[PDB]
Amino acid sequence: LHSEIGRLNNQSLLWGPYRPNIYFGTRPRIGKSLMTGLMWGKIESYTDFQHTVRYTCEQNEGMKGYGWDEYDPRRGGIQSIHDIQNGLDITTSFVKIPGGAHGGSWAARIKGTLNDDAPKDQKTIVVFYVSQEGENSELEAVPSENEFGYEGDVILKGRSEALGNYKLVVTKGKGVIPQSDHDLSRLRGPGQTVVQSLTYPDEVLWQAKPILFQQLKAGIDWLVENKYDVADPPPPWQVYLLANKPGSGNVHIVQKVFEGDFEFDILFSSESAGKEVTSKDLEREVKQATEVFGERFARVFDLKAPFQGDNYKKFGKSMFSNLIGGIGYFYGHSLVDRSYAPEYDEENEGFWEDAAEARARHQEALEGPYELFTSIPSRPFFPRGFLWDEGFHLLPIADWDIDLALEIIKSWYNLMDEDGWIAREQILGAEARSKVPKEFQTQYPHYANPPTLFLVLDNFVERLRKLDETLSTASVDNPEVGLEYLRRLYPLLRRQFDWFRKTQAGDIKSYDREAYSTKEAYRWRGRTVSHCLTSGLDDYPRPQPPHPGELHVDLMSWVGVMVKSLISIGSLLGATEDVEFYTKVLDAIEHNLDDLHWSEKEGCYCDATIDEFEEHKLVCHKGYISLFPFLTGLLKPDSPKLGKLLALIGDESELWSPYGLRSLSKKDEFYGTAENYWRSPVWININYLAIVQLYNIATQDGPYKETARDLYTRLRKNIVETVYRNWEETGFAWEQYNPETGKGQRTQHFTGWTSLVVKIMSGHH
Numbered sequence: 001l002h003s004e005i006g007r008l009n010n011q012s013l014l015w016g017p018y019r020p021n022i023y024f025g026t027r028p029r030i031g032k033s034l035m036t037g038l039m040w041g042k043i044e045s046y047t048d049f050q051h052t053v054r055y056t057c058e059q060n061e062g063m064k065g066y067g068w069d070e071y072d073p074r075r076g077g078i079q080s081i082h083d084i085q086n087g088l089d090i091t092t093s094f095v096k097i098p099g100g101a102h103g104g105s106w107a108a109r110i111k112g113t114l115n116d117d118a119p120k121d122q123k124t125i126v127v128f129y130v131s132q133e134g135e136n137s138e139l140e141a142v143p144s145e146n147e148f149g150y151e152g153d154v155i156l157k158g159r160s161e162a163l164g165n166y167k168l169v170v171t172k173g174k175g176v177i178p179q180s181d182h183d184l185s186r187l188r189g190p191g192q193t194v195v196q197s198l199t200y201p202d203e204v205l206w207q208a209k210p211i212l213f214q215q216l217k218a219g220i221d222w223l224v225e226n227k228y229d230v231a232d233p234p235p236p237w238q239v240y241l242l243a244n245k246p247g248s249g250n251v252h253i254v255q256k257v258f259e260g261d262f263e264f265d266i267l268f269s270s271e272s273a274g275k276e277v278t279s280k281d282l283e284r285e286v287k288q289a290t291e292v293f294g295e296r297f298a299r300v301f302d303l304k305a306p307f308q309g310d311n312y313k314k315f316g317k318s319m320f321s322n323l324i325g326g327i328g329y330f331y332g333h334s335l336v337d338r339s340y341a342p343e344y345d346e347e348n349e350g351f352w353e354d355a356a357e358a359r360a361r362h363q364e365a366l367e368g369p370y371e372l373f374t375s376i377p378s379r380p381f382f383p384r385g386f387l388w389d390e391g392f393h394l395l396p397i398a399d400w401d402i403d404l405a406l407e408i409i410k411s412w413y414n415l416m417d418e419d420g421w422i423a424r425e426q427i428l429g430a431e432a433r434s435k436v437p438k439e440f441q442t443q444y445p446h447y448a449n450p451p452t453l454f455l456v457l458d459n460f461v462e463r464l465r466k467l468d469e470t471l472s473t474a475s476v477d478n479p480e481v482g483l484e485y486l487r488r489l490y491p492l493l494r495r496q497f498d499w500f501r502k503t504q505a506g507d508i509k510s511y512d513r514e515a516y517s518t519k520e521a522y523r524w525r526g527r528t529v530s531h532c533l534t535s536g537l538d539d540y541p542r543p544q545p546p547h548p549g550e551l552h553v554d555l556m557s558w559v560g561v562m563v564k565s566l567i568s569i570g571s572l573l574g575a576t577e578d579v580e581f582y583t584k585v586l587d588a589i590e591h592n593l594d595d596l597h598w599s600e601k602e603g604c605y606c607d608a609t610i611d612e613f614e615e616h617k618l619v620c621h622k623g624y625i626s627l628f629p630f631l632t633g634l635l636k637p638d639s640p641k642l643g644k645l646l647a648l649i650g651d652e653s654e655l656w657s658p659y660g661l662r663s664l665s666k667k668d669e670f671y672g673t674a675e676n677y678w679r680s681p682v683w684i685n686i687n688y689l690a691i692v693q694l695y696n697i698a699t700q701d702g703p704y705k706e707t708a709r710d711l712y713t714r715l716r717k718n719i720v721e722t723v724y725r726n727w728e729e730t731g732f733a734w735e736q737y738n739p740e741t742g743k744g745q746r747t748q749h750f751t752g753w754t755s756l757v758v759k760i761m762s763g764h765h
């Protein structure tokens, strides 16, 4: 029965628009298979299309905005693109039609509407680019009846082991096609849909822009050789129309020129299913996917006061759809230093210098290949898997579709090496590497990242204890299936738990340190003078100088999150001998949090170092870090320590801004300093943790119930309204929010954990 739900999930999720790095394209969850990409650009001149053409996601003054209005990876959805440079409002509707033995069929409608400022006679070039990777696989453009190109549909017929037989149709579409009266039209035709079928070695098929431009440049060279010159030049749009040469190959370029508004369909028909997919099929399946998305949202994301209104429902749909619509499939080699150089052990003073020397050996090599199926923080700036971001992404996604969330968790845990290491940053293949400076690619096996994926596993278990609709909950509705997943995953959770304990161990025994436990103490590896990249709070102030004797209260608190999850899961599995050791590790963390990290002087938890005089010193920087034992749910609701943290959180002079909790206190000496990344701005992921914990204390018998209730109510409001106002004004989710002004700053299209705001509005944690 596990195998069945497994095979059904596989078949449901195989196809998607799983290329979030580009405006619009498709691929299945298969490393070497059939992929598609959309390109468009106005052409006003002989030189402008190279600069106007769109393919990979960016955000600049030329683009107003873009994203998913509606999305479910099982059904498809609708994306809006507002392109100022090209004068176009584009719609890409994508739909899946289940059937056959191969992951089903799918269809897309591309619609371009010139905006008010565009010339009513603008010529827009549109390209649908189709590649197929594989040794024993074929794809062929059925040639046209016409001499120079296509009056109607373009039929591609192909086959692979993975997809069996399929056909891919690009329809005639609707819109005016310009006609050239030039002598060239006797040889190129007056203007029509064209296809070039090419082959390149499989590993470069992703470089669709250079592949296209090489063909455009060969056309222009041909014009020059055959005496088409500046005395009598063809119009720009004919100069940039490829000579029709359909055939077989692993690349198929389908090119259309439109004058004014346009639309055209892409129909993917799996032979192994019923009848082929039609345009009338696409139109209906789209209408129905909208109805279903509407119905699921109103149940799953029931927005509570004061966010019940339609304005906030639109907001919620946009923030959610962009989050789950960012889901990608990633395949290829990753860059890794497997030297395990001894300098990476960071056991002497000045360890950052030694670590730099080891990195300068440049022993890192390509390894894999790996696949990953994950949501992403940002399509334009960093469209790839980030380990602790994914824990946040999956909290809303899990509500929507717990079986999808568990699929993504599983994909992340299949990356884990023999030691219990997952790389914090997953850059799989040359396409992914294209977006990342060479200096920032190398993953380090000694680099951790917060294990936020356990928070998701926690929600799963809580839900476990208490056809597309069916598949989405299959793993909570069929408890036998739920436990089998946990049984298969548990060992790797344990492996990661031990890996933290072997690789991110702090040192008690070697210093004048007393504590309830000689074991429980942690220090993030990878830290430099200014940074602790691995903690996730890049420039949050830490002990200066960095020191082998440091202890990180956030890191211990994450180990605390991990043990509590292992207790829950281990028990659901009856692994008694493990639960005992976990029950005892937790007990030791609860104590050592107080003995090593609690400041009675300051009224908050702090990190620790050892002095110039070699004694344990608390290093207190009031901010996110200070709150961690609370944010991670480790303290008793009656704890006096919780009492003092609630005071700090609610204190306007420290953390409390009209716009949410400041990453760092206004009273801290480092407030607003340096890159000021985690040194003041409001981050939605940490505010989300605060809101959830406040609500927990707020709905419990205890002394702080009423304070917790006030701070919840107000913080929920401040966080939602800040993200809303900025979305209303800019159309973007932002990476962080200015505490002085409330303005969105840093990375746009951050969906991204800023999308947690849909869960903050829906309440009932």
Ligand SMILES: [N-]=[N+]=Nc1ccc(NCCc2cncc(CCN3C[C@H](O)[C@@H](O)[C@H](O)[C@H]3CO)n2)c([N+](=O)[O-])c1
Pocket: 377, 381, 382, 386, 388, 389, 535, 536, 537, 538, 539, 675, 676, 677, 678, 746, 747
């Ligand atoms: N200090 N530092 N200075 C700055 C750092 C970044 C800045 N802007 C975005 C640049 C950028 C590009 N590629 C990847 C990433 C990682 C983003 N992010 C980092 C989170 O901290 C981490 O927790 C989190 O996992 C990851 C992923 O969401 N970021 C700026 N800026 O725009 O001025 C100053």
